[PDB]
């Protein structure tokens, strides 16, 4: 009988207290949803790498277990029993100490038998097992038995992401290797994944076996004739012997040091030019072997001399490890040559992993190896059969995971990048596909793209807007029920009815208010270099004082960035000399500005839209950063001051139009300013006046929608939130980098100084200091690049303030989509929001048109319009609003005769 | 990269402020841009922006349109102003009052839709 | 025809400079918009 | 204290300011301190809330317009 | 110019190609490879 | 490049040296290659 382990068997990986964190642990765990064997009340189950043991009982049938390798008298075995009074452990070692679900975890590592446990009043909940005891039994355990429903699962080395509660309780976990969604969660260090595509890891085919290929020679080297020589030469006339075509077994070989190699490794390497130099003295890659020859031997050595002057026989072994064909090396057994399969290979000490194939390279007899452009081995001559084999790394590639978001579904698709589906790793065992999970093909759910093979999404022939970009024109989305892949649609097809003489004239218009969000500044950061690198360690500070002006450069760069942020804000918002105020009576010809004008009721004196913007952008983690020496400097201009600048700009534009940006503010009624702006887009003034109320209503409607368009869309303020998130992420990464060891024995300086002598403590501390200094320099460089980008954004925002708010712009698409009428600024936490009011023509109508009109034999061209017709009579109209008028001498000018203008049309000019 | 952005901006200003007259607000100095003159500087350029700044503003009473013979008149290339008794039409950026005639205005509709229309004589 | 691309980031089936770079772990990703879509 | 020297005490969002007297008047920012606070040398060092400029009210109404009667030719300098 | 080549780097493959001991050692260097991947992914998205 | 190590091949270092000195050599190599990657990414960011 088998059953599902669900999410059970999580234990506390260490004795350290943690709280409100996500912590990654690589340890022996019970994989989620494992098939655990179920017994009912017994056999001797194996003890593979550790055992999870659950018991659901109320009568104490289960008491204990026996552990061992053979469970006989010839081999030592362990024994654990829980008596009603105490628990007795015996092995050379004895130990005694003190429905319901009892869960246990047993491990055997490094001669230690470790036991964790938990008790609970298989269930489908989460419970973390606390440790019980480590015992130094010192015996290898391969089997075990329960001593009389109980469940047995087997642990394997897995990576888990554990979530600690506010009071430090492990409340949730993610098994990183369970499936692609869990791998994505572990990559992001989060339990929730938003919609998107995520590079999670790389799949790598694993080596099937290992092969060794050494030369066929078996003769032993004449080491005895060198070391066991009756008489050694003199140090000046030192003796040299060559060693070639033999098997140097160095185990036959007092002082024995080696330069460039280790004495415990010489049996594994293959050497090219071995020379042994022997002589006698008194007390480059190779080895030096010196030994006292007092009882064997001008020095004039005598038995009554001291050790410092006794004779010493010295042998120097010199060899070249610069590959080339190998003539001498130690005892290694060659295996068969495995081809066309990812294997671990060892060719005369050249170790690697990959696929070996027949090579067409035209080697030359002296050539034992081939190299690629990167100076890495690419071809090898087999030492025994002398054939040329190409080495190519076995199949690998990148893996991306497409998720609709965990808030919507747990289904995922998987993209194997740069791989066709015929070569997608298809393995029935865990000896391939490094992510170690499997997504199987079910026919219609495997698709080929120029970006790779997509498994888990069905390709539909329909086209939609891109939701999750896959690449090469392919996108994916949650259909709802399943994930679908498709070719993205560029938009709805449209054919403009072009002809010789047809023109479309708008008969109506729409007042459109659109939003543009621009970052203006980012968080000003200061770093206490010593506090970050050393943090209360005075010895670290003294050592750090020897690395030059690194911290001075970083401080200068960060101070420059901080000053630039205030400069950006000033350049964007401090354009007006005066602080203009709105008049007490807020009547502007029917235009309602209450949503953008400041509200006296609010203490901040912000507009409703500005209040919404400041609510929609989120500006103990701060304390954690502060304790490491990373601080945030306040901006020079407060939010109240920026809002005051914005109110001054709005009052100036509302009460004076564009005049206050070019000189003294000149009051003008708002309908008259609107008529000016209508003139600015080639529409006559009366069109505004005769439609005044309607226009006002449209604006009042459009501005009314703005709030919703910012409070309903999730990522409306995505750019400012991105600025904030980038700053927070950079600081959090800087903080988390303090737990890195960078190759040292610990990440705590006071632990290194309190356990090591200064000569080696200096090495470890130098490793830590260089790592942390590199982290700081990387952070500062990224800050400089981001500051340049933010400065470009701020220059653009200042240009928009000048050209869209202080004037009317004729630049297409610079101040909104349609024809720009005017714009309003609103301050936002780290930037500015422009509300662009534009004129969009609407309700177009077809008309017949002509270039000119022939009348009395003269050609007439329209002065400020275009000729149109119902079909019988001919009018002249303005081009952006249908207002037909009688064609007179006053709205027309004469040029030439009606003999050269192609398309000229006969009519009368009143 | 920062200096390249500055040099691109300087080239844009040379093209648009020195080789032409720019309508872009505050791109070629404060005020209504007239012209610009370049001067070389050790590692850069100095633009001398000549702009027109209005001064000595005066208050006037204004109307959107003038009603005459039941017809609404809108100023062709100006704005209606008044001493207080008579009504003139003037260019927007410099006080140059002119007699309201049928040659500096245009007619559109009756005196029933425009809010703020004022009765006056439009000389012919 | 006048600009000679290096990779363009399309499928490379197991079997020159691009191959060496890929074996060193450096790959090119295809653009989202194809040349036909941009045209 | 690490600086080993000691030094008209004021609290700001930027920190503790010692040696400057906070005045109620507002001037243009001379030396920026932070969060709207600037410093200046008056015989003494003063800290103050920076001013944004002179308050101004445009005489807006639905039938009044201000029209310039004169002009000034301005020549300004931009250094790049 | 509008876009440039989108590059991806397998950090482990570049630094410690086929050497498992080197990757085990590289695991002690923190989030360098993660930061590099984030930067390159940002660039790649920016190209599109 | 070797970056002051005995070789630019990780496998050779692991096969020729005991862990105490292999640590120094592999640290040099890994630091050099991480620096190369970081330089490449920084220049890619500026170019982007
Ligand atoms: C953690 O334990 C404390 C101790 O009483 C409790 O108040 C708090 O609610 C717990 N946190 C949870 C349950 O998230
Ligand atoms: C020298 O001779 C002794 C005994 O004959 C032997 O044990 C030893 O291995 C020899 N040394 C060498 C280097 O062959
Ligand atoms: C992948 O290999 C198959 C089998 O040869 C081939 O048909 C297919 O075209 C390859 N993929 C691509 C994208 O060419
Ligand atoms: C007008 O367009 C039609 C096609 O729509 C074309 O056949 C005709 O030649 C064009 N007119 C002239 C004068 O060519
Ligand atoms: C123009 O559109 C508005 C709606 O915005 C509508 O109320 C009005 O009747 C339209 N005018 C004409 C002439 O169609
Ligand atoms: C302006 O709009 C707001 C919100 O729609 C409304 O409450 C207010 O009454 C309006 N003001 C006028 C004068 O109609
Ligand atoms: C103008 O004519 C084209 C075809 O001649 C037609 O498709 C279009 O709908 C017409 N537009 C209007 C407003 O009737
Ligand atoms: C000509 O245009 C006028 C608009 O003034 C319209 O009343 C009349 O019906 C049009 N004639 C035809 C034949 O469409
Ligand atoms: C327009 O009228 C003139 C008058 O002489 C005539 O010659 C010409 O053919 C007419 N055009 C058309 C297209 O009928
Ligand atoms: C215009 O009138 C207002 C209010 O009567 C006054 O404050 C302002 O100074 C006047 N403007 C000029 C230029 O006299
Ligand atoms: C009205 O304008 C006329 C100029 O023709 C003249 O009487 C005077 O300048 C104005 N009247 C007043 C009272 O200013
Ligand atoms: C303007 O004249 C019309 C008709 O001549 C009259 O109804 C209206 O009251 C007059 N306006 C004023 C302000 O007296
Ligand atoms: C025009 O302005 C005056 C004074 O500013 C005000 O009393 C009047 O109500 C305004 N016009 C309208 C239609 O509200
Ligand atoms: C205009 O200003 C100038 C000074 O720049 C002065 O000399 C001149 O008299 C003024 N003209 C008028 C009409 O005020």
Q: Which two structure tokens, joined as six digits, stand for A566?
A: 């205030």
Min CA distance, A698 vs chain D (Å)? 21
CB contact under 8 A, D67 and B56: no
Beta-strand ranges (E) seen in A784-909 are 819-828, 831-850, 853-855, 858-862, 866-869, 874-877, 885-886, 892-897, 905-906
Give the 3-state secondary structure of residue A282.
strand
Identify which of A578, A654, B89, A593 has the alpha carbon closest to the alpha carbon of residue D61.
A654
Both tokens assigned to A784: 């400089």
Contact C13 A395 (CB under 8 A): no
Residues of A in contact with F16 (CB under 8 A): 260-262, 265, 269, 321
Ligand 8: distance of its center to the CA of A901 in Å? Answer: 26
Q: Ligand 9: does its nearest atom lie under 6 Å from the Cβ of A906?
A: yes
Ligand 11 in reach of B85 Cβ (< 6 A): yes
**For a substitution probing ligand 5, which of A505, A507, A508, A839 has the most ligand atoms within 8 Å of its CB?**
A508
Residue of minimum CA distance from atom 1 in ligand 4: A500
- Going by their DSSP bridges, the two strands A210-213 and A342-347 should be labelled as parallel
Closest CA to A352 of A314, A389, A319, A404: A389
Structure-token match 């996108």, residue found: A475
Contact status, residue A175 vs residue A160, Cβ threshold 8 Å: yes
Which chain A residues contact residue B30 at CB under 8 A? Answer: 662
- Residue-range definition of the domain harbouring residue A98: 2-199
Nearest CA in chain D to A671: D62
Q: Which ligand is nearest to the CA of A873?
A: 8
Residue A280, φ and ψ in degrees, nearest 5:
-130, 135
Pairwise CA distance, residues A108 & A135, whole Å: 9
To test the contact with chain F by mutation, choose from A348, A369, A743 the residue with the greatest count of F C-beta atoms within 10 A, namely: A743
Entry field: residues in chain A: 910
* Residue A854 Cβ contacting ligand 9 at under 6 Å: yes
- CA–CA gap between residue A640 and residue A634 (Å, rounded): 13
**Closest by CA position to A299, among listed A313, A311, A314, A315:** A311
For ligand 5, atom 4, name the residue with the nearest CA.
Answer: A510
What are the residues whose beta carbons fall under 8 Å from the beta carbon of A837, sequence distance 6 or more? A511, A512, A513, A699, A702, A816, A820, A821, A822, A823, A824
CA–CA dist A304, A580 (Å, integer): 107
Residues whose CB falls within 8 Å of the CB of residue A438, separated by 6 or more in sequence, listed in order: A427
Which residue from A677, A604, A674, A599 is spatially nearest to A642, judged by alpha carbons? A604
Which residue has tokens 């069109």?
Answer: A687
Distance CA A157, CA A94 (A): 30
Measure the CA–CA gap between A668 and D67, rounded to whole angstroms. 9
- φ, ψ at A440 (rounded to 5°): -90, 150
Across the interface, whether the CB atoms of B55 and A664 are under 8 A apart is answered: yes
Cβ distance E48 to C31 less than 8 Å, yes or no, reads: yes
> For residue A134, what are the β-bridge partners?
A114
Token pair for A646: 């914005």
Q: Report the distance separating Cα A845 and Cα A833, nearest Å.
A: 36
Which sign does the torsion angle of CA A691, A692, A694, A700 carry? positive
CB of A202 closer than 8 Å to CB of A237: no
Q: Is F15–A265 a contact, with Cβ atoms under 8 angstroms apart?
A: yes
Q: How far apart are the first and last CA of chain B?
A: 64
Coil vs helix vs strand at A564? helix
Please tell me the distance from the alpha carbon of residue C17 to that of residue C6, in angstroms, as a whole number: 9
The residue in chain F having the minimum alpha-carbon distance to the alpha carbon of residue A374 is F1
CA distance A791 to B2: 9
Output DSSP code: residue A892.
E
**Dist CA A422 CA A781 (whole Å):** 44
Straight-line distance from the first to the last Cα atom of chain F, in angstroms, rounded to the nearest whole number: 27
CA angle B74, B79, B82 (to 5 degrees): 105
3-state helix, strand, coil in chain C (%, to 5): 30, 10, 60
Is the Cβ atom of A165 under 6 angstroms away from ligand 1? Answer: yes
User: Nearest CA to A470 among A456, A486, A481?
Assistant: A486
Among A450, A422, A401, A416, smallest CA distance to A203 is for A416
In this complex, does chain A touch chain F, defined as having at least 3 beta-carbon pairs under 8 Å apart? yes
How many angstroms separate the Cα of A232 from the Cα of each of A244, A276, A295, A312?
21, 12, 13, 10
Residues of A in contact with E17 (CB under 8 A): 376, 393
With beta carbons less than 8 A apart as the criterion, state whether A878 and A682 touch.
Answer: yes
- The dihedral built from the CA positions of residue A718, A723, A724 and A726, taken in this order, carries a sign that is positive
E17 and chain C in contact, CB less than 8 A: yes
Report which of A839, A893, A894, A847 is spatially closest to residue A867, judged by C-alpha positions. Answer: A847
Angle formed at CA A494 by CA A492 and CA A497, multiple of 5 degrees = 170
Conformation bin of residue A728: beta by default, left when phi > 0, alpha when psi is -120 to 50: alpha
Taking CA atoms, A859 is separated from A279, A445, A642, A872, E33, in Å, by 118, 69, 59, 20, 75
Residues A619-626: contacts with CB within 8 Å, 24+ apart? A619/A724, A619/A829, A619/A830, A620/A20, A621/A728, A621/A732, A624/A735, A625/A731, A625/A732, A625/A734, A625/A735
Q: Where are the alpha helices (DSSP H) in A502-585?
A: 529-533, 538-544, 550-573
Cβ within 8 Å of residue A807, ≥6 positions away: A658, A661, A662, B24, B25
Tokens of A200: 């999670």
Q: Point out the residue among D68, D72, D78 whose CB comes nearest to the CB of B47.
A: D78
Other C-beta atoms within 10 Å of A631: how many? 15
Mutation test of ligand 2: which of A221, A222, A224, A246 has the most ligand atoms closer than 8 Å to its C-beta? Answer: A224
**DSSP 8-state code for residue A326:** -
**Nearest ligand 6 atom to alpha carbon A587:** 13
Ligand closest to the CA atom of residue A451: 3
Instruction: Say whether D80 and B10 touch across the interface (CB within 8 A).
Output: yes
Contacting chains of E (3 CB pairs or more, <8 Å) are: A, C, F
CA distance F5 to A576: 62
SS3 A193: coil
> Do the beta carbons of residue E15 and residue F33 sit within 8 Å?
yes
Cβ–Cβ below 8 Å for A578 and D32: no
For E13, the closest chain C residue by CA position comes to C25
Distances (CA, A) of A877 to A194, A321, A869, A907, B78: 54, 92, 10, 16, 21
With a 6 Å cutoff on the Cβ, whether A707 touches ligand 6 is: no
Q: Which residues of F touch A (CB under 8 A)?
A: 6, 8-9, 11-12, 14-18, 21, 23, 27, 30-31, 38, 42, 45-46
Q: Which residues of A touch E (CB under 8 A)?
A: 199, 202, 352-354, 376, 393, 396, 398, 417, 469, 733, 736-737, 739-743, 771, 775, 778, 782
Q: In angstroms, how far is the first alpha carbon of chain D from the final one? A: 45
| 3-state SS class at A328 | strand
Of A331, A373, A374, A378, the closest CA to residue A350 belongs to A378
Distance in Å, CA A652 to ligand 14 centroid = 27
Tokens of A250: 């160095």
**φ and ψ at residue A124, rounded to 5 degrees:** -115, 45
Nearest-angstrom CA–CA distance, A30 and A39: 18
Instruction: Return the bridge partners of A380, or none.
Output: A369, A389
How many degrees, rounded to 5, is the angle at CA F21 between CA F19 and CA F24? 110
d(CA A248, ligand 2 centre) in Å: 14
Residue B47 near residue B61, CB atoms below 8 Å: no
Long-range CB contacts (within 8 A, 24+) of A45-49: A45/A143, A45/A144, A45/A145, A45/A152, A46/A142, A46/A143, A46/A144, A47/A106, A47/A108, A47/A141, A47/A142, A47/A143, A47/A144, A48/A154, A49/A107, A49/A154, A49/A155, A49/A156, A49/A157
| E-only strand ranges, A233-283 | 239-243, 255-259, 270-271, 274-282
Judged by CB atoms closer than 8 Å, whether chains meet at D35 and A634 is answered as yes
Tokens (6 digits) for A23? 């912590």
CA distance D73 to B51: 6
CA distance E32 to E43: 17
Residues in chain A closer than 8 A to D53 (CB atoms): 576-579, 648
**Cβ-nearest to A450 among C10, C24, C27:** C10
Task: Name the closest-CA residue to atom 6, ligand 12.
Answer: B119
Q: How far apart are CA A567 and CA A570, in angstroms?
A: 5
CA distance A523 to A728: 9
Supply the DSSP string of A113-166, one letter for each residue: EEEEEEEE---SS--EEEEEEEE-------EEEEE--EEEEE-EEEEEEEEE-T
Cα(A642) to centroid(ligand 6), Å = 25
Query: Which of B83, B97, B101, B121, when mutated, tests ligand 11's pocket best, judged by the most ligand atoms within 8 Å of its CB?
Result: B83
How many Å apart are CA D32 and CA A639, to the nearest integer?
16
Task: Name the resolution in angstroms.
Answer: 2.5
SS3 A412: coil
The alpha carbon of residue B75 is apart from the nearest alpha carbon of chain D, in Å, by 15
Alpha-carbon gap, residue D67 to B91, rounded angstroms:
9
CB contact under 8 A, A580 and D58: yes
Token digits for A795?
């220059």
Nearest Cα neighbor of A470 from A413, A396, A406 is: A413
Q: How far is CA A460 from the centre of its chain?
A: 31
Structure tokens that stand for A690 in this block: 């005769």
How far does CA A410 lie from the centroid of its chain? Answer: 21
Q: Which residues lie closer than 8 Å to A887 by C-beta, 6 or more apart?
A: A853, A860, A867, A874, A875, A876, A907, A908, A909, A910
Q: From the CA of A330, how many Å to the nearest CA of chain F?
A: 13
Pairwise CA distance, residues A364 & A302, whole Å:
58
**CB-CB contact of A836 with A804 (8 Å):** yes
Do C32 and A418 count as a contact with CB atoms less than 8 A apart? no
**Residue A85: CATH number of its domain:** 2.60.120.960
Radius of gyration for chain E, computed over Cα atoms and rounded to the nearest angstrom: 13
CB A265 within 8 A of CB A347: no
Residue D20: count of CB within 10 angstroms of its CB: 22
CA dist., res. A827 & res. A650, Å (int): 11
What are the phi and psi torsion angles at A393 (to 5°)?
-60, 140
CB D41, CB D67: distance < 8 Å: no
CA of A708: how far to CAs of A601, A604, A689, A714, in Å?
A: 22, 22, 30, 11
Chain B residue numbers touching D78 (CB-CB < 8 A): 13, 29, 46-47, 49
For the residues of A575-596, what is the DSSP string, one character each? T-SSEEE--SS--STT---TTT
Largest CA distance in chain F: 44
H or E stretch including D40?
Answer: strand D37-41
CA distance C10 to C18: 11
d(CA A561, CA A784): 7
Q: What are the two backbone dihedrals, phi and then psi, of residue F20, each rounded to the nearest 5 degrees?
A: -55, -40
Strand duo D37-41 + D45-49: pairing? antiparallel
Identify whether the C-beta of residue C24 lies closer than 8 Å to the C-beta of residue E17: yes
| Distance from C-alpha of B80 to C-alpha of B97, rounded to nearest angstrom | 9
**Which residue has 């490890």 as its token pair?**
A321
For residue A752, count CB atoms less than 10 angstroms from its CB and return exposed for 0-12, middle for 13-18, buried for 19 or more.
Answer: buried
Tell how far CA A281 is from the center of its chain: 62
- Is there a contact between A498 and A822 (Cβ–Cβ < 8 Å)? no
Compute the distance between CA of residue A247 and CA of residue A218 in angstroms, rounded to an integer. 6
Kindly state the tokens that stand for B71: 């017809």
Question: Does an H or E element contain E37, and which?
Answer: helix E32-47
């Amino acid at each position: 009988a088998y059953t599902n382990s669900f999410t059970r068997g999580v234990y506390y990986p260490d004795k350290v207290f943690r709280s409100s964190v996500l912590h990654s642990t690589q340890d022996l765990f019970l994989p989620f949803f494992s098939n655990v064997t179920w017994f009912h009340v017994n056999p001797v189950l194996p003890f593979n790498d550790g055992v999870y043991f659950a018991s659901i009982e109320k009568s104490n049938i289960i008491r204990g277990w026996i552990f061992g390798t053979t469970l006989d008298s010839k081999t030592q075995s362990l024994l654990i029993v829980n008596n009603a009074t105490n628990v007795v452990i015996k092995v050379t070692f004895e130990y005694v100490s003190q429905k319901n679900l009892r869960e246990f975890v047993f491990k055997n590592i490094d001669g230690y038998f470790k036991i964790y446990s938990k008790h609970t009043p298989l269930p489908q909940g989460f419970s973390a097992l606390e440790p019980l005891v480590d015992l130094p039994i010192g015996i290898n355990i391969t089997r075990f038995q329960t001593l009389l429903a109980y469940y047995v699962g087997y642990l394997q080395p897995r990576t888990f992401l554990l979530k600690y509660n506010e009071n430090g309780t492990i409340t949730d976990a993610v098994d990183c290797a369970l499936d692609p969604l869990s791998e994505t969660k572990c990559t992001l260090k989060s339990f929730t994944v938003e919609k998107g595509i995520y590079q999670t890891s790389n799949f790598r085919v694993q080596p099937t076996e290992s092969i060794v290929r050494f030369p066929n020679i078996t003769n032993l080297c004449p080491f005895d004739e060198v070391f066991n020589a009756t008489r050694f030469a003199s140090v000046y006339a030192w003796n040299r012997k060559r060693i070639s075509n033999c098997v140097a077994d160095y185990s036959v070989l007092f002082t024995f040091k080696c330069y460039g190699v280790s004495p415990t490794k010489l049996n594994d390497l293959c050497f090219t030019n071995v020379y042994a130099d022997s002589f006698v003295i008194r007390g480059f890659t190779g080895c030096v072997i010196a030994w006292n020859s007092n009882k064997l031997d001008s020095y004039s050595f005598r038995p009554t001399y001291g050790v410092g002057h006794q004779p010493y026989r010295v042998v120097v072994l010199s060899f070249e490890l610069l590959h080339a064909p190998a003539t001498v090396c130690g005892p290694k057994k060659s295996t068969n040559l495995v081809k066309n399969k990812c294997v671990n290979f060892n060719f005369n000490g050249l170790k690697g992993t990959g696929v070996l194939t027949e090579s067409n390279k035209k080697f030359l007899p002296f050539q034992q190896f081939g190299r690629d452009i990167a100076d890495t081995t690419d071809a090898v001559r087999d030492p025994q059969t002398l054939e040329i084999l190409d080495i190519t790394p076995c199949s690998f590639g990148g893996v991306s995971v497409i998720t609709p978001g965990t808030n919507t579904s747990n289904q995922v698709a998987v993209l194997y990048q740069g791989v066709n589906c015929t070569e997608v790793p298809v393995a029935i065992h865990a000896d391939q596909l490094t992510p170690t999970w499997r997504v199987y093909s079910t026919g219609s759910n495997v698709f080929q793209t120029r970006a790779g093979c997509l498994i888990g999404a069905e390709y539909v022939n329909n086209s939609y807007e891109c939701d999750i970009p896959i690449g090469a024109g392919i996108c994916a989305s949650y259909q709802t029920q399943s994930i679908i892949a498709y070719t993205m649609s560029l938009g709805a097809e449209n054919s403009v009815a072009y002809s010789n003489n047809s023109i479309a004239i708008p008969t109506n218009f729409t007042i459109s208010v659109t939003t543009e969000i621009l970052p203006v500044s980012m968080t000003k950061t200061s770093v206490d270099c010593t506090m970050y690198i050393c943090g209360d360690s005075t010895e670290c500070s003294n050592l750090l004082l020897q690395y030059g002006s690194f911290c001075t450069q970083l401080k200068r760069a960060l101070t420059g960035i901080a000053v630039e942020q205030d400069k950006n804000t000033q350049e964007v918002f401090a354009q007006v000399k005066q602080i203009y105020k709105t008049p007490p009576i807020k009547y502007f010809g029917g235009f309602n500005f209450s949503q953008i004008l400041p509200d006296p009721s609010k203490p901040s004196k912000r507009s409703p839209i500005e209040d919404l913007l400041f609510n929609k952008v989120t500006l103990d983690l701060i304390c954690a950063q502060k304790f490491k020496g990373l601080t945030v400097l306040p901006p020079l201009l407060t939010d109240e001051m920026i809002a005051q600048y914005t109110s001054a700009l709005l009052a100036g534009t509302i009460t004076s139009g564009w005049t206050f940006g070019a000189g003294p503010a000149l009051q003008i009624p708002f309908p008259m300013q609107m008529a000016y702006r209508f003139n600015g887009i080639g529409v006559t003034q009366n069109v505004l006046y005769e439609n005044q109320k309607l226009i006002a209503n449209q604006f009042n409607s459009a501005i009314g929608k703005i709030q919703d368009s910012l409070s309903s869309t999730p990522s409306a303020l995505g750019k400012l939130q991105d600025v904030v998130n980038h700053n927070a992420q950079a600081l959090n990464t800087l903080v988390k980098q303090l737990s890195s060891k960078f190759g040292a024995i610990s990440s705590v300086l006071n632990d290194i100084f309190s356990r090591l002598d200064p000569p080696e403590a200096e090495v470890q501390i130098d490793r830590l200091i260089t790592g942390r200094l590199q982290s700081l320099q990387t952070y500062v460089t990224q800050q400089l690049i981001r500051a340049a980008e933010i400065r470009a954004s701020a220059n653009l925002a200042a240009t928009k303030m000048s050209e869209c708010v202080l004037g009317q712009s004729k630049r297409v698409d610079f101040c909104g989509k349609g024809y720009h009428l005017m714009s309003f600024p609103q301050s936002a936490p780290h930037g500015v929001v422009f509300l662009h009011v534009t004129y969009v023509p609407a309700q177009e109508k077809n008309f017949t048109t002509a270039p000119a009109i022939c009348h009395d034999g003269k050609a007439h061209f329209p002065r400020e319009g275009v000729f149109v017709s119902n079909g019988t009579h001919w009018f002249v109209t303005q081009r952006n609003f249908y207002e037909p008028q009688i064609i007179t001498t006053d709205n027309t000018f004469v040029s030439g005769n009606c003999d050269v203008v192609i398309g000229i049309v006969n009519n009368t000019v009143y | 990269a920062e200096i390249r952005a500055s040099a691109n901006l300087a080239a844009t200003k040379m093209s648009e402020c020195v080789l032409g007259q720019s309508k872009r607000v505050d791109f070629c100095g404060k005020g209504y841009h007239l012209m610009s003159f370049p001067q070389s500087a050790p590692h850069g350029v100095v633009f001398l922006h000549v702009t027109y700044v209005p001064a000595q503003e005066k208050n006037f009473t204004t109307a959107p349109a003038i009603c005459h013979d039941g017809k609404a008149h809108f100023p062709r290339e100006g704005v209606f102003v008044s001493n207080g008794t008579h009504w003139f039409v003037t260019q927007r950026n410099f006080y140059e009052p002119q007699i309201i005639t049928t040659d500096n205005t245009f007619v559109s509709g009756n005196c029933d839709v425009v809010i703020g229309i004022v009765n006056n004589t439009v000389y012919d | 025809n006048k600009v000679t691309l290096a990779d363009a980031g399309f499928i490379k089936q197991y079997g020159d400079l691009i191959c060496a770079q890929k074996f060193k772990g450096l790959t090119v990703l295809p653009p989202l918009l194809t040349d036909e879509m941009i045209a």
